[model samples]
Target: AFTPASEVLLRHSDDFEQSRILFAGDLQDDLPARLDTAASRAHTQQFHHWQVLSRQMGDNARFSLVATADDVADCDTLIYYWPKNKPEAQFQLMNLLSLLPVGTDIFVVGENRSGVRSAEQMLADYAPLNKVDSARRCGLYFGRLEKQPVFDAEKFWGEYSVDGLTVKTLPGVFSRDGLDVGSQLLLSTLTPHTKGKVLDVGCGAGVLSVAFARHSPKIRLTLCDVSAPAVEASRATLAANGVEGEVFASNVFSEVKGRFDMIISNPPFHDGMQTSLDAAQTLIRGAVRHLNSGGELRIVANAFLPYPDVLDETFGFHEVIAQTGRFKVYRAIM
Candidate 1:
């Protein structure tokens, strides 16, 4: 099924009939099969989307799991799905634009409320963007790269310090600016009791891992996230802080292996711009199987979310260790 933005893009597939299309960033459907193109290639940062779409577009398109531009160097057209984070969108746009030769087509699409119109100003220096279609509360922009921009990986890394730990993050990684309130509350609950093999699910920028390591140098740490940017940012954060840990991309627990003494997370509840609980539910429900006997599962989430009930259903017994006006920390034991 096509998302609202993808549905709008699908309405105008005839515009680039003979061009090789390189779709980058947020993708939610199999529109590449519908595009009348010479070839199709997808570069997505989310492992969940990549894992599912690769099966859907078996021979229709080539897929790259990471965000490097070299994977689709031969493509003549770029189809960019605007991300909610402005910096991430700019990074992907610039990175992809740097690889395309002058005059190649670039189409940007997103829901209007997601700031899709900003592409006009964003591309002012490199090309002229025109709103080609407006439907389904989404916008489709058409442009041709005229002056390519340089993309330097070093320029995109943003760093900040929280509770004496230096965290380095890339665009779109959770809490890229600093530690969020939920995580701050969650960190306050961590004690010397948190030790042994520890797992940090959705470990954006490795904040929880670094904190755990600081709490006790004896504990072994493992971090995982579905976004490639988050995984890379976690590794960078760990290295910058002189902490040792393992970081990798996983779709919830899809790629995770082995059992851990503890599982912790400030789980994501949004899928793109819409509120979604599938990821968090999967993590909470499946945590027991991956945890050792007497192991604990801790999570911080928006107070309005039904995580407390989910936790009770999962473990049959759970407790709210800490809470604020807007956030709650839940603890469950295996």
Candidate 2:
């Protein structure tokens, strides 16, 4: 999917040979690998790509991580892997405008269902935009900035804040604007005693983590997510609450090493192009490895995901703790 887009950019324009291209948002795993293969076959000094990380982290090795606008000052063009939803998409567009120079070319690409056409309008609001192409239900749009906008990190923070906490979310973070319904339901059912060393998997803006900490002052907390922006949002949420917790980015529990006495999640279940039961199932299956003996794993998910069967196989026992009009909460003990 990305190769054709990259090829079009490379072949149709000399810009790829002389202009520094800054790639923003998540670069899919295979895209980078493909770039490496392409690099071995061609020589092009004009095409330099750097992956920007919204939060600070040490040594990502796989991609060069640039944390701020200053990191892209030399780039002549910018390409954004437009996020799938509205709020985060807005954040990405606004942030990119702040970084690149006026007259800099910006390219945005995404699938039809991900609101690519809608993004063309959104991009037009910031700059003069042109729809470059549309194929296979995907579109690419280009725009030239007439003026550089102010980098309002605070405004981006405002777009995602809720419950008196200013959330720090970048493009593609889940529930960027406010608490999700399943998370709200899970939060309401949190028992006072279900606290110890707590882990909030897929913590999003850290709402559940803060709620857990507020309910149990003595409990140590860990909040983790696959999205870098979500981790940043978690950190901001913890700082806002004047509470302390560990936050890290990981796919499922890969970066988490300890056993928790209590674990909670409003786990994610979708991939970029499809609904994935894998995320929720992986979390359930791995819960035992991260939970101490007799520890609890509590989570909320859509009612139709067959999560109960997965939970039964994973933990040997599971129970429904609560249910809403569309969501169900499950608790399992290991």
Candidate 3:
């Protein structure tokens, strides 16, 4: 299986025939198997993509799930698929440059709307990037690391204080700089009734969970996100606010265990640049098994999404508790 970006990378696969390559970023499909060289390793910060790639590679040590480029092993050539978040793409590039030896080759590919053209400027500090291919509404480039740049994890973290709580975030995490409006709306609707063991699905930087902890000090918090960076950022956000929570990487409820009295979230409705309801539907459909008796599911999503129907179908009834111009908060009690 091949994505447009992967197809672009494959066009130049022979160029890295003898080179050890490390493929990174939002890898949508299996590119390693199509290449002539088996000397390649694949890494992705998105757990969902990692799951897909790992399954395709099956029992192969060449696939690794990484939080950041720092977790990736050194490689002679680095093939990066530009991420939706520019800072994240740059962050990974910087980290890779720090680990790779001088003069190592670099290849980048991404859709035009994703700002793939900026690769020249983003790579300018370390090397000169030349556009090599443009097709399928995507751009591909080639570059080399001219010098090793030091990467400090602390330097990339962005933080903000809201509602007397501090949120620390990394580049790729959702709402990295601060609370997004959807989460803000959800947090505003949180009530004292939301108690006991509460779980936040697709918890981005854990703003909702942290706010919940502050609102109800007695409630136990558990948060999960599919992105590794979001998972770590959520942990950091919790620590910064002096709040306690169990945060980890999970594809919706894939890795979640046990039951909760309340499952809340500003759930992710979009996967990458496309509108995707799979995660949200899974969260709603499978929520019953993960909830205790009398448990409730509360979530906020863009008003344009069909979440209300899914929630109502899953729980027999759902209420639109609150609404913003673009978002709606829904509640369903079991």
Candidate 4:
């Protein structure tokens, strides 16, 4: 019942005419495609979808919403699709609330398993709230506030400084709170190489790219991630360290072209709901297409993934550069 109402509002309601919509995290694929069909005029309504990184690179302009800072200049309404993990979900909810005016309408839609059932108490903590409806295991909650509460977004935006590189991460982005242990292990194994063209895939907060640029100032670096916030974090990290690189938002090199001497990643192994090796498999299989002849792909992944076999199939040569109890560093040369 609520799903039909939400769809109708999305299609027929004039509420968002000339209105700006901020979509935080993964937006449903069907909603956007339908919205495109319902557009009244070019650019009259703006839709921005925010994520830690995007797997499918599209033409829509993506604005980075860092958890620590309000990157979104302003919005009349904010719609959030709840993420699965609780800490990041809470952080995202609070951050969106921080950006709106008092009495601004906030809409939340999510599956029950995604924590929508429990979010009512959280909404009531700061605003007047109502449950709009539920359908297909999805629920919509609406809230309005008479007084906008002051939330320190920056305080929640976790920060870290490693080897002179400072990183700021937004909620829901990978390792936003700190360096991932696997990434740290991979970074430690890197030997200084001559700077050429280098790619950091799944580059959260630019940590790996920053380190690579610092070590080889002569190399030009390319940083890419699916999440817009992570890209913003990487941009900030690059600026903080005075390292220069081209940063783009992509799921895993979908928009990336050209050959690179080296491609490195602490590649993502999990999708949102479960641990799937699909991302790693994609990287391993695609690395050859993006690498120069004899170019190399270096990565750190959880030890349990069948990455060596994947690499062997993809690049023909796979070697373990280092390993710890939880992670392994592998290099595949094409």
When 2 and 3 are scored with lDDT, the better candidate is 3
* Per-residue C-alpha lDDT of model 3 across residues 196-309, encoded as one tens digit per residue: 999888777888778788868889989888877788888888888888889888878888999999888776557542344555678798898899999888888887777777
Looking at model 2, residue 182 earns an lDDT score of: 82
User: Which ten contiguous residues of candidate 1 have the minimum total lDDT?
Assistant: 59-68
Instruction: Tell me the TM-score of each prediction against the true structure.
Output: 0.92, 0.76, 0.90, 0.71
Best by lDDT: 1
53: Cα error in model 4, Å: 15
Give candidate 3 misplaced runs (Cα > 4 Å): 16-18, 56-74, 174-177, 269-275
Ranking by TM-score: 1, 3, 2, 4
List model 4 lDDT by residue over 167-216, tens digit each. 77666564532467887787787677665688888777777777777777
Model 3 residue 94 lDDT?
80
Clashes of 1: 0
User: What 10-residue stretch in candidate 4 is worst by lDDT?
Assistant: 38-47
Model 2 clashing residue pairs (backbone)? none
Q: What is the lDDT of candidate 4?
A: 0.65
For residues 1-334, write the lDDT of model 1, one tens digit per residue: 3687777776776766778888876776767555667877777778777777678665333343234546666788889889887878888788778778898888888977888888899999997899874775787888889998987877888887878989888886845335778788888998864568988887788887887788778788898887777888889888988888888888878888999888998876564422445555688887988999989999988776767666777889788899899888989998
Question: Residue 110 lDDT in model 1?
Answer: 90
The residue-by-residue lDDT of candidate 2 on 109-188, one tens digit each, is 66667777787667665676777755676667787777766657565554445676555554456553257788789888
lDDT scores for all predictions? 0.79, 0.65, 0.77, 0.65
